Write a protein that binds this ligand. Structure first.
Ligand SMILES: Cc1cc2nc3c(=O)[nH]c(=O)nc-3n(C[C@H](O)[C@H](O)[C@H](O)COP(=O)(O)O)c2cc1C
Ligand code: SF4
Ligand code: FES
Ligand SMILES: [Cl-]
Ligand code: NA
Ligand code: NA
Ligand code: NA
Ligand code: NA
Ligand code: NA
Lengths: 155, 417
């Protein structure tokens, strides 16, 4: 298993960025998930090498950080906050609209491998509860009609 | 310059300091920052000795804004008493439920933060600084990177900043979903490319920190005060607000209010004033049942007339105000707090690991109505025994809000038993 050169460039760039190269492990992992739509298990041996780090160190890191996913490939991750504030303001309304529109519940990918709903803790936007992200873009949920328009931006 | 989409968090200020620009929901770039006199405090500071800056920030009475309230001047003095090299870290993990204040300074007035970092680094003799920003803030990361490049093009970063002899580079690092990486020692661990496990203290970071070197970790807002202190002088700054807790304070208000958002106010402000005078009262004008102080504390409606300070019978915390009205099930809300601590314990300590999981497991059963009598007596037990043997503050407080909720709303819990 080898990364495309397109991708190795970005990873080298992150590795040169910090003074020591092992400090770039999270930025490399972010970049891999961004590129593949998940962290492939087979990807971790060549990463460990670029970071001059043993494999099992990288394994424990991926497992510790909740943003990283090794199970399911997904083009758009819909991160839905389930913490106290969004619960009070209508997480359940948002999840219902998502189920009506996409036909899936938290932790499921759609059968086309396009959307995965990912329940996350507070997203630091509680004034605009209930909050969700679609990859990097972030929004307040107002209604099912509104949600439907937003999701239609992601092809 | 497209950034990822961001909700436009409402912001209002009575002091016109940290929110001077950030009260408008847009990126203020360097040209607009320079027009309000930005980077002139930096210039001023570079004509004073590092020691003199330490003294000014000490005399200002600036306390940390990340929670502990530790005097920033004293922290800086402790670090400079140890031989260098020295590191400066900006804590931008902001992952506590109900807290969304640091992100608006980052996304709207990045040069306020960058200016503070440069001054602060020079004060402690640091030539390397880090901003550790949570990974669910992608937009703030990209905005910070672009702003750093701007400051560099204008000669505010690099080698020999404005002919001063000071060198500084600011590296921007991202998290990957871990609340504990906001604890300063676990942040340094994450910065070292490891898992975010809190270190035992002592030693504190100011002696042994990043690569074992003297390290100052400061919160975004603590740092954002530093340019103001340099610009106005210490004596002027210390007279802002109450003497016991001087300076601008930021209150994130959420939940059942009409005007949820971030408010810049003095700390002599009352909890009722925050909700009713500033935040537009309750939503639907329902009566207030409780205020959740983030995930740390629970105040009842009979405690709304308390100063939002760090005093006996004060509000404390990070002044985070989540409002619950009369129709809100507080044991359903207690479960939500339980579930936070369950997902966020790092696992190192046994009582924290096991107690955070079991608190959430059992309270779910109690909520769903399928808890045995042994599940009830065990919930109570688990709740009072998360703390033992823990080597950081998350274990210390994981049962705290929930315990107050049992003590202050017994009628609401009896409904479930
Ligand atoms: C579990 C936990 C989470 C924390 N999260 C944060 C955080 O998100 N931001 C922060 O500035 N401090 C946080 N702290 C406190 C820091 O460890 C530290 O006290 C602070 O960053 C020091 O900066 P200050 O002097 O500017 O307050 C947290 C502490 C604990 C125990
Ligand atoms: S108290 Fe909990 S969160 Fe803190 S170090 Fe121990 S196990 Fe980790
Ligand atoms: S509780 Fe959902 S963003 Fe804070
Ligand atoms: Cl602390
Ligand atoms: Na977010
Ligand atoms: Na709205
Ligand atoms: Na200019
Ligand atoms: Na940069
Ligand atoms: Na986090």
């Amino acid at each position: 298993f080898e990364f495309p050169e397109e991708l190795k460039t970005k990873l080298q760039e992150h590795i040169n960025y910090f003074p020591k190269k092992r400090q770039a492990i999270l930025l490399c992992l972010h970049e891999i998930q961004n590129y593949y739509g998940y962290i492939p298990p087979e990807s971790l041996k060549p990463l460990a090498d670029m970071l001059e780090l043993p494999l099992n160190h990288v394994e424990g890191v991926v497992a510790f950080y909740d943003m990283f996913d090794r199970e399911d490939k997904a083009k758009y991750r819909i991160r839905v906050c389930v913490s106290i504030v969004c619960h009070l303001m209508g997480t359940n309304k948002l999840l219902k609209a998502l189920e009506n529109i996409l036909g899936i519940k938290p932790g499921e990918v759609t059968p086309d491998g396009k959307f995965k709903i990912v329940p996350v803790q507070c997203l630091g936007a509680c004034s605009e509860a209930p909050v969700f992200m679609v990859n990097d873009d972030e929004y307040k949920f107002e209604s099912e009609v509104q949600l439907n328009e937003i999701l239609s931006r992601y092809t | 310059r497209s950034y990822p989409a961001i909700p436009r968090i409402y912001a209002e200020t009575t002091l016109n300091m940290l929110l001077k620009r950030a009260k408008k929901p847009r990126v203020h770039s360097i040209d607009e920052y320079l027009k309000d006199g930005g980077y002139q405090a930096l210039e001023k500071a570079l004509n004073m000795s590092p020691e003199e800056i330490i003294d000014w920030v000490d005399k200002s009475t600036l306390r940390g804004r990340g929670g502990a309230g530790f005097p920033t001047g004293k922290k800086w003095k402790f670090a400079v008493q140890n031989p260098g090299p020295r590191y400066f870290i900006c804590n931008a993990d902001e992952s506590e439920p109900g807290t969304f204040k640091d992100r608006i300074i980052i996304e709207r007035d990045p040069h306020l933060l960058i200016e503070g970092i440069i001054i602060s680094s020079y004060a402690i003799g640091a030539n390397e600084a880090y901003i550790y920003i949570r990974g669910e803030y992608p937009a703030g990361y990209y905005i910070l990177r672009d702003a750093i490049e701007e400051a560099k093009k204008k000669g505010f970063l690099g080698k020999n900043i404005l002919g001063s002899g000071f060198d500084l580079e600011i590296y921007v690092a991202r998290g990957a979903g871990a609340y504990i990486c906001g604890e300063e020692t676990a942040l340094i661990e994450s910065l070292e490319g490891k898992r975010g496990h809190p270190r035992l203290k002592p030693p504190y970071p100011v002696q042994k920190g990043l690569w074992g070197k003297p390290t100052v970790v400061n919160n975004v807002k603590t740092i954002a005060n530093v340019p103001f202190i340099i610009s106005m002088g210490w004596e002027e700054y210390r007279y802002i607000g109450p003497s016991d807790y001087a300076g601008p304070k930021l209150f994130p208000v959420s939940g059942k209010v009409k005007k949820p958002g971030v408010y810049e106010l003095p700390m002599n402000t009352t909890l009722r004033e925050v909700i009713f005078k500033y935040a537009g009262g309750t939503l639907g004008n329902k009566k207030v049942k409780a205020v959740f102080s983030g995930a740390l504390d629970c105040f009842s409606s009979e405690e709304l007339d308390i100063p939002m300070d760090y005093s006996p019978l004060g509000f404390g915390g990070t002044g985070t105000v989540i409002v619950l009205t009369e129709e809100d099930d507080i044991v359903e809300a207690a479960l939500k707090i339980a579930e936070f601590y369950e997902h966020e314990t790092c696992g190192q300590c046994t009582p924290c690991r096991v107690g955070c999981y079991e608190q959430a497991n059992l309270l779910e059963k109690i909520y769903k109505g399928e808890a045995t009598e042994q599940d009830w007596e065990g919930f109570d037990f688990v709740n009072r025994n998360i703390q033992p043997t823990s080597i950081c503050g998350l274990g210390a407080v994981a049962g705290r809000l929930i315990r107050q909720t049992l003590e202050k709303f017994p009628e609401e819990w009896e409904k479930y038993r």
